[PDB]
Amino acid sequence: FPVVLVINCGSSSIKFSVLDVATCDVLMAGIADGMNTENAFLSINGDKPINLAHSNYEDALKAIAFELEKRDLTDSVALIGHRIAHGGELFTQSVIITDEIIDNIRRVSPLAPLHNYANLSGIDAARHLFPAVRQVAVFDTSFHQTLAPEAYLYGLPWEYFSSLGVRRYGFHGTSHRYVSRRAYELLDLDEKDSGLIVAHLGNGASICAVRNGQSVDTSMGMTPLEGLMMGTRSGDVDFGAMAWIAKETGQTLSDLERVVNKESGLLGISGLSSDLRVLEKAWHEGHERARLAIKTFVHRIARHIAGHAASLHRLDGIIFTGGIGENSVLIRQLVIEHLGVLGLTLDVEMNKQPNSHGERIISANPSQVICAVIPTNEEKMIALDAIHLGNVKA
Amino acid sequence: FPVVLVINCGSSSIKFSVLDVATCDVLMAGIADGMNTENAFLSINGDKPINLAHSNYEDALKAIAFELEKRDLTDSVALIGHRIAHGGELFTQSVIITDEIIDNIRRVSPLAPLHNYANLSGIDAARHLFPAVRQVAVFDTSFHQTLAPEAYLYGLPWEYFSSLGVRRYGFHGTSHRYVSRRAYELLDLDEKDSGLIVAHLGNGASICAVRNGQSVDTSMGMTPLEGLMMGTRSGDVDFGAMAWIAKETGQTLSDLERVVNKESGLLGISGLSSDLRVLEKAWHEGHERARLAIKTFVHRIARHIAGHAASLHRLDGIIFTGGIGENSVLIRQLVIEHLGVLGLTLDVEMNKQPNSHGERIISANPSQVICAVIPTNEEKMIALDAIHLGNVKA
Ligand SMILES: Nc1ncnc2c1ncn2[C@@H]1O[C@H](COP(=O)(O)OP(=O)(O)OP(=O)(O)OP(=O)(O)O)[C@@H](O)[C@H]1O
Ligand SMILES: Nc1ncnc2c1ncn2[C@@H]1O[C@H](COP(=O)(O)OP(=O)(O)OP(=O)(O)OP(=O)(O)O)[C@@H](O)[C@H]1O
Numbered sequence: 016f017p018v019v020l021v022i023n024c025g026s027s028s029i030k031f032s033v034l035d036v037a038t039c040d041v042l043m044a045g046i047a048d049g050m051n052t053e054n055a056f057l058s059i060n061g062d063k064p065i066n067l068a069h070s071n072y073e074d075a076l077k078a079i080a081f082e083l084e085k086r087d088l089t090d091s092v093a094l095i096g097h098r099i100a101h102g103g104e105l106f107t108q109s110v111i112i113t114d115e116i117i118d119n120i121r122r123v124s125p126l127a128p129l130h131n132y133a134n135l136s137g138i139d140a141a142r143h144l145f146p147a148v149r150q151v152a153v154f155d156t157s158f159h160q161t162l163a164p165e166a167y168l169y170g171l172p173w174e175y176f177s178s179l180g181v182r183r184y185g186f187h188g189t190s191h192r193y194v195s196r197r198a199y200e201l202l203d204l205d206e207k208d209s210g211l212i213v214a215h216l217g218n219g220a221s222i223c224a225v226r227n228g229q230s231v232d233t234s235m236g237m238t239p240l241e242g243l244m245m246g247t248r249s250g251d252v253d254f255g256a257m258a259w260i261a262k263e264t265g266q267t268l269s270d271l272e273r274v275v276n277k278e279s280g281l282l283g284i285s286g287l288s289s290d291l292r293v294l295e296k297a298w299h300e301g302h303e304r305a306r307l308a309i310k311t312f313v314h315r316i317a318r319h320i321a322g323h324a325a326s327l328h329r330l331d332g333i334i335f336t337g338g339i340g341e342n343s344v345l346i347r348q349l350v351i352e353h354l355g356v357l358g359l360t361l362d363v364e365m366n367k368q369p370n371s372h373g374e375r376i377i378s379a380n381p382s383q384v385i386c387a388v389i390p391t392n393e394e395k396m397i398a399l400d401a402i403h404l405g406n407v408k409a
Numbered sequence: 410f411p412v413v414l415v416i417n418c419g420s421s422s423i424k425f426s427v428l429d430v431a432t433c434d435v436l437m438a439g440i441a442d443g444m445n446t447e448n449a450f451l452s453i454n455g456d457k458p459i460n461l462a463h464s465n466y467e468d469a470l471k472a473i474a475f476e477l478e479k480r481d482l483t484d485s486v487a488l489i490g491h492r493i494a495h496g497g498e499l500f501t502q503s504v505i506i507t508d509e510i511i512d513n514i515r516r517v518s519p520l521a522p523l524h525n526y527a528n529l530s531g532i533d534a535a536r537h538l539f540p541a542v543r544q545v546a547v548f549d550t551s552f553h554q555t556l557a558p559e560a561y562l563y564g565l566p567w568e569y570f571s572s573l574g575v576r577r578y579g580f581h582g583t584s585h586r587y588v589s590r591r592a593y594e595l596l597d598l599d600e601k602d603s604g605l606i607v608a609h610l611g612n613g614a615s616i617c618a619v620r621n622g623q624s625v626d627t628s629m630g631m632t633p634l635e636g637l638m639m640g641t642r643s644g645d646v647d648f649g650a651m652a653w654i655a656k657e658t659g660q661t662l663s664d665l666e667r668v669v670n671k672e673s674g675l676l677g678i679s680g681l682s683s684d685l686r687v688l689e690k691a692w693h694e695g696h697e698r699a700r701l702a703i704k705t706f707v708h709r710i711a712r713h714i715a716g717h718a719a720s721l722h723r724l725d726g727i728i729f730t731g732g733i734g735e736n737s738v739l740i741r742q743l744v745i746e747h748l749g750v751l752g753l754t755l756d757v758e759m760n761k762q763p764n765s766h767g768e769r770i771i772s773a774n775p776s777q778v779i780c781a782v783i784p785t786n787e788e789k790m791i792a793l794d795a796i797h798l799g800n801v802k803a
Pocket of ligand 2: 611613687731738
């Protein structure tokens with residue numbers, strides 16, 4: 016039984032998973048943290064954090080390579096899937112990695128320079144170590160390329176779009192794609208005749224409108240910065256306000272960029288934590304700024320869910336997914352109550368059930384729109400694209 | 410029969426109106442354009458553009474003062490209403506202008522420096538020329554102060570709000586207030602038990618959610634830049650995208666600020682006109698970029714209308730107002746069709762009727778939500794606040 020090797024190269028780390036081709040089961044998982052720094056270490060299943068100090072993207076990938084031999088599954092690796100940050104306008108679906116693709120990934124790289132170079136470092140590393148192994152590129156953006164111009168164009172002058180490529184792209188595509196597919200089965204809906212709203216809520220948070228199997232509107236923009244307020248990200252922010260802060264504090268464009276990325280969001284308002292689970296406890300203990308941060312977070316989600324419903328002809332399902340979506344009973348209820356206008360009644364027996372209950376409906380019967388939780392599995396989706404492309408001949 | 414003098418001092422001009430106290434009828438209207446420049450001129454009813462070259466805010470206001478004597482109504486002026494751009498956090502309602510207010514208007518001025526100084530120039534000018542005449546300040550923001558923190562807080566660090574005042578304020582309040590009040594009569598709704606969405610669409614465009622008589626959510630942010638795409642304004646724009654353009658073209662924060670204000674929006678996408686009526690004709694003549702600009706404009710409105718509905722417990726009415734709202738048959742229909750999810754059926758007989766038909770329902774009977782057009786009258790609303798405050802003793 017062959018296996019798939021999934022790779023997600025961030026700027027700071029390398030996340031991986033080894034899934035069985037036969038069943039799509041997780042056989043192994045690990046992280047290679049502190050990349051390009053003075054100290055780099057690898058942790059698999061939380062066995063023993065082995066530290067090969069000062070190691071690059073290739074060295075750490077070679078470290079996982081040793082560990083695949085150790086656990087005697089190295090020669091069973093039939094496919095390698097790469098998560099790519101930004102596919103630009105060029106990628107509509109997942110592709111088998113060839114020289115062409117590598118050039119095309121480098122071509123769109125300027126749009127997400129930090130994250131994409133890491134992906135390219137990982138593709139080369141995996142190519143080097145695994146030679147006759149078919150490799151697949153899977154893009155966070157591809158699912159959102161079905162959007163019409165009215166949905167992806169900015170109010171900015173046409174020039175910026177045509178010559179520089181400034182448009183809405185959207186992220187969490189793989190998750191949005193996976194969850195949406197799964198919702199067709201659980202809700203027993205006809206894909207080609209449906210309208211779903213998906214709320215991927217974790218550290219990064221985005222909404223997506225899925226009309227008849229296609230993505231028609233999405234929360235995030237050119238960068239992951241637009242839309243919902245997140246763990247450390249501000250989300251929807253008035254540009255006037257942003258430029259006003261610049262003049263008032265004498266901060267540079269780069270300064271503000273760091274603030275909206277790493278200092279804002281839930282962390283920003285509460286001034287306590289970026290982690291939602293911590294902020295839930297602080298509210299319980301009478302922390303107002305944590306309570307505000309959640310109420311606001313809830314509010315911007317409800318606003319964007321309702322907002323995204325406009326791009327549907329009919330609203331059949333609202334689906335929660337991600338770290339917060341799948342696990343936070345509070346946030347799910349608060350968001351839904353904020354959407355009472357859409358004629359939703361919640362089943363609090365079903366909303367109380369923990370994530371172990373997996374794919375679950377949480378709406379009551381008098382509800383005009385079905386609510387459900389569907390655990391996202393991006394590794395499984397990257398595997399399936401790879402398997403399909405594994406049967407292809409290129 | 411006494412009269413009210415309404416004044417709106419922009420950076421470039423002074424708009425005025427003389428309304429009869431007895432009936433709220435327009436007796437006179439005019440503009441003082443090209444302010445502080447080498448050439449300043451006054452036009453009343455389009456009679457004869459008289460030009461007093463190189464004149465300040467006081468000189469032009471003194472020119473209108475002469476014309477009020479000429480038409481023998483100078484001594485009938487019982488009240489003077491001033492439109493203020495930014496009331497900050499200090500003003501919840503309209504106030505009788507006193508020294509205190511002047512200080513308080515100067516205090517919040519930094520938030521909208523260009524527009525507010527003009528208002529203050531106008532208040533002093535009117536005070537100078539009209540001494541024993543009661544004067545009222547009316548704020549574009551005041552109506553939106555009912556918003557809860559969850560609705561007005563940004564994802565930015567708490568510090569920016571508490572020490573600098575960076576929050577959502579919202580604009581077109583007077584219009585939103587007037588139109589909403591009027592909708593209670595036309596739709597025969599109980600104010601204290603209602604949920605309305607108001608779409609003020611002109612050169613500046615903003616949405617407002619009115620729950621039980623109060624404003625609970627609004628499109629624009631700290632500055633008029635946030636929210637809907639407008640004539641020359643971009644609207645909702647990803648900050649990542651904005652900072653990316655800065656690095657790519659080497660433009661300053663001020664450069665980009667000019668672009669999103671005066672070069673973007675409908676003007677931006679079409680690359681033809683900021684005027685909607687012109688762009689409607691271009692589409693008819695097969696202009697794609699004008700057609701896109703409209704389709705996008707329609708899209709962001711439908712998105713924000715649906716989005717704002719979340720802050721209501723029930724959706725009773727969607728009301729169109731402003732230059733575009735009251736007059737464009739196309740945009741009204743396109744927006745409503747984009748909101749089919751909300752269960753709206755349109756009466757196209759009623760939607761075809763021109764603005765002469767005034768306050769009019771445009772929705773069909775099977776429609777779950779009532780649609781209507783209500784012409785905004787900001788001068789009438791400024792008059793009514795002034796009349797009420799005229800009966801007060803301060
Ligand atoms: N039991 C729980 N109750 C409440 N909140 C919980 C509970 N368990 C986790 N969280 C919150 O979920 C957030 C992390 O979500 P994630 O999906 O694991 O974040 P990720 O970073 O791994 O995935 P993303 O999908 O965000 O990746 P990117 O967007 O960054 O690419 C925590 O805030 C936690 O409080
Ligand atoms: N008959 C018409 N059909 C289609 N469009 C029309 C028709 N008549 C006018 N417009 C469009 O309306 C816009 C101007 O609206 P406005 O309300 O007069 O603009 P304003 O500047 O006077 O008022 P605002 O409410 O925008 O003020 P601020 O926000 O700037 O404070 C034009 O685009 C025209 O095409």
